[model samples]
Target: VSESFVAPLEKRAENDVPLGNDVPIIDLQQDHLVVVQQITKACQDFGLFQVINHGLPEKLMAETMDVCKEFFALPAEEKEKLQPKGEPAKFELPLEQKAKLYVEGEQEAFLYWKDTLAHGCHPLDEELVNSWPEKPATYREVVAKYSVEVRKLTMRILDYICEGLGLKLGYFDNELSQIQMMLTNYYPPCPDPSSTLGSGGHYDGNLITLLQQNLPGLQQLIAKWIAVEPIPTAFVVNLGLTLKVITNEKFEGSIHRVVTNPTRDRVSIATLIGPDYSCTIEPAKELLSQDNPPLYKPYSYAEFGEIYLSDKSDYDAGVKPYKIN
Candidate 1:
């Protein structure tokens, strides 16, 4: 099987190990009030979490993967029709394109992305590109159906975060609930998996990312230095810088990357939802009471994204947060 991303880190099995002992599995939906308490503590203490029984329909998941696999399996020429350069957008490729090129250490011919709003400004390359892939035939309908369900799951999680912080269910109304959905991806095997990096070891730019990876390609660094195996059914939830800022550093945004697999092909489905780029992001007022003060500067999501993207060249240097002092 060819690896889809990360050609370097896992080549030597340097950090291939089960999750760190410090990590714990927490169910995020049980006992709403208790779940909120857990969320508060988990955010302040653990930057990440593994969630089970989070309400992702198994049927949708199976179908989504089926469509992704079929779509990727399309002949190279067929897939090329939706290639990165072929898209109407500029300077940005679809997540599939970015994931492939980032790992291959070269630009991939094709890319994929979905638009959130019917007509609104999206993150640079996030606007909806191609409507559907013609090869799979039913690909668009299935993916669109699943995207709606995924969006609902994401909104529920966001609301949970707000409630955990003692805010109204819609506190993040402007930031939390906007147009967003999950992405189902397929990366064919690479002949020489070790020559490139899969997805880079950078943090998710959104507020929350819920992922389920079927392949052995997902890799994560825990407690600053520990490797965890990617498990199926279990959702790998990553908290982003926005959450860290919202929680005043009480919540952590973890740094993780993907490695290429030489033995098995890879498939992953992930959902990303967060504050509207136009919304101002800063530490939560409640977290600043008397004990903890604000640790980051307040800025609009769009401005922060600008600074974040500019530093992509030095992303792995443990780059400093945009708000220094």
Candidate 2:
């Protein structure tokens, strides 16, 4: 772990805690009305949920996992070629390139106890995706295919989210120019798993993030934080800042972090779907009325990114400044 990687005592989550029954486990193919209601409640309260019967092919997910592990298993020399540069659009980020973990400006940089390979997946950037490792042979194909499936699944879920909020079916679909990115992470066995985090505590800036992990290491900051026990072949969907603003705070953008496993490596893929850089995000008009005023001022994804990228301290409360007076 890097020098700044030690989390303040307050940020440490208890290890091996069981999740309560209150955690939402939604079935995408459940009765139409039931699905809408469940998703709505999950968004408004938990801001996180697990979905079974999601349309993504299980085989594709497995293949994606296999390729990711293969990639990370490569020698350090092979992986470093993709290390992220200062360029905003740099595709891959080797473990060493990440900043050290710190909260609220408490300390200098602290690197996470993990390695990540991130790239733009949708509105596919041929040049960028092509830059990915071809050594795994099927790496590019499996990742590209999985990205397509995940993107479709994300939009379908968003449609339901819109219905749940009483907005037109395509409210988000038509209004926002969607952008998608996929990140594959590998968390190696740590000597002191209890003291360090695989990934730091933070919320995503996208509208929704779809995740698939092969093991049980991801944790959510609930009323009392608990581990998201690995579900057999299920995707964890979490709400994000853009959704919170668009829904006028009716939806919650959950805070979450990853913990390290000392016994085995943890591999996970997160597909972040959000509005394009130019799309302006604001509270939905239907959700805003005289009785219920808007909560966030309109802002572009670019504007939001500037603040989000400025510092890690902003992770805990990055969406606050956009709030309306």
Candidate 3:
């Protein structure tokens, strides 16, 4: 039975639901009570949503996108200059090299048609942030500006999420928002789009992920694949594993995948808001009780990070070893 089980792609396609911009949108300009209620609902139901009127400047966003394309447009030899020299913290890799990091069981299931540049973002490391492509001229400055804005947004959202979960305002901030990172992805057009994907089905290990893209390639799988269309001037917000555990299963993390386009390339910037390496994740005591026992045991972000990288396919199941019952 296990061997016979294949990813029900065909069935999923047939039953595809056009979400059609119905995802809850939180307008930062709105009243605090209204924003909090919408955010709470969005977390509990979709685990993914959008934000409008976010404080980031429009000009900054445009410059960030322009610089990103410029970086990817560099010559192969030029881009290779930033290739990882075995330092897991920072690097640039072509699609072939990136493909080598695909999930375990689906090693042959599909190949990602994307290139990636990953690096640390938080703690304000000027030297590290300066290591990107200087040829793009504004790459470093634009990305740094964008990072600062997103970090600010993540913290504000964190406060509301904490309130929704009945936790203190600084509950997630003290640990979860410590180590921030970014993954800039460029998915080139594919010859055989159906056979390939930009990314595979998986859940993020961070507390929340703020993704900025202007393309229509991201889809989250619940009972079926639902298209998360790109909303103009909005960032797609998705919850992650740490939030799920902290909320004690009251909320959900995103289980999403990306498909490739045949004619046009796609680019996306993901700001992963994760915990300090030493922070331990567990159900909030306020959310746990005799009637509702803790679902999982406490585990350090370092341990979970190793499992996430090594055991790629586990979703919420990754915390099973820590299950109380």
Candidate 4:
């Protein structure tokens, strides 16, 4: 069924189990313990959740959306100047897969290689210097503001995740703080839609993904045949490998997919919030005590992603320890 047909479980609930809006919100400002507990449960049980009073003002959120539209609205040539040509890593997928991965309708984008910004090849900086649309006068300002807010929210969530796991609150936060941000996206119309998948089933290797998709074309199956989360009025979030590492695989970085839509194009933007690539992630020592032992091996994000990409035979590549050298 389409996302429209499946309303949020909150709206259709029959029990007194308060709908999300009515559910208790642990004020991140005052209650540290509650924030830790809430985030932990959201991570463990739901694998995701929305935070309304996330401290990002409505104006900032709205303006950021406008900036995204303006950036994408640039002339094809202007946008093409920054397309992924000699990327350090060859990120690939089909044209239909683009719409599914990007969730933004009917567009192809080269947002890969966020690691490039650490050097100087990023196009956003150049775009800010010359490419902004005049109508959305404050597009650059809004982007800067929103980025800072998103980073703050990401670190806070990371801290809570660490705390809930009985590790130091800042344990993973400070380490995975490099925060690679990219907007690689695509959107396409399909003729034999059911015959094709938008993007194949796979799991992200990052720590967590914060997604904001519009125009509705992303369909993810976290469980069996059923779609675990579908498009809707709210944002869609999912887990990643760092979580699997920290939780001793108690919480899983389950498989998910994006399907193609024939009726319309789709658009989506994702912030692949993750730890710095330098951090050697593996099953946490605490979780793998003498009684439990270890189930995963230590490897850097760069190393793991390399094996993950090259080994094409399996997405579960390097989930356990192995000597790549």
TM-score, one value per model: 0.76, 0.89, 0.87, 0.69
Write model 3 residue lDDT over 1-325, tens digit each, in one string.
1222233354223224476466677897899988888899999987998998988887887788788888878886666566545322222122121211112224324335567776667766656665545667777778888889989898988888888878888887676787677777888886655556577677877899999888888888776677898875898898998888888889988888777776899889889888877888998898888887888889877777666654544565467667775
Output the number of the TM-score-best candidate.
2
lDDT of 4 at 283: 73
Q: How do all the candidates rank in terms of TM-score, highest first?
A: 2, 3, 1, 4
By lDDT: ranked, best first: 2, 3, 1, 4
Please give me the total number of clashing residue pairs in predicted model 3: 0
Question: In candidate 2, what are the lDDT values of residues 1-325, reduced to their tens digit?
Answer: 4445676666665776676467798998999889999999899888989999997888888888888888878885665456434222322122121211112222345557766676667565677567667657888888878888998888888989988888888776753636676777778888777678887777777789999976887878775678786885899998887888888888988788888777899888888888777778889887778899887888777777656655466553556677775
Per-model RMSD to reference: 5.9, 4.1, 5.0, 8.9
What is candidate 1's lDDT per residue for 41-117, written digit by digit as tens? Answer: 66667666766677878778788778777766777677655555753223221222222212122132212121111
Q: After superposition, how far is residue 107 of candidate 4 from its true place, in Å?
A: 22
For model 4, residues 184-276, the per-residue Cα lDDT tens digits are 344455554444445544566677765555554443333332333333223345567667766776665645545556566554555666656
Residue 161 C-alpha lDDT in model 2: 91
Q: Which ranges in model 3 have alpha carbons more than 4 Å from their true place?
A: 1-17, 85-106
Candidate 4 has a TM-score of 0.69
Question: What lDDT score is found at residue 90 in candidate 3?
Answer: 22
Worst 10 residues of 4 by lDDT: 112-121
Q: List candidate 1 stretches off by more than 4 Å.
A: 1-15, 84-130, 177-181, 191-195, 223-225, 313-321
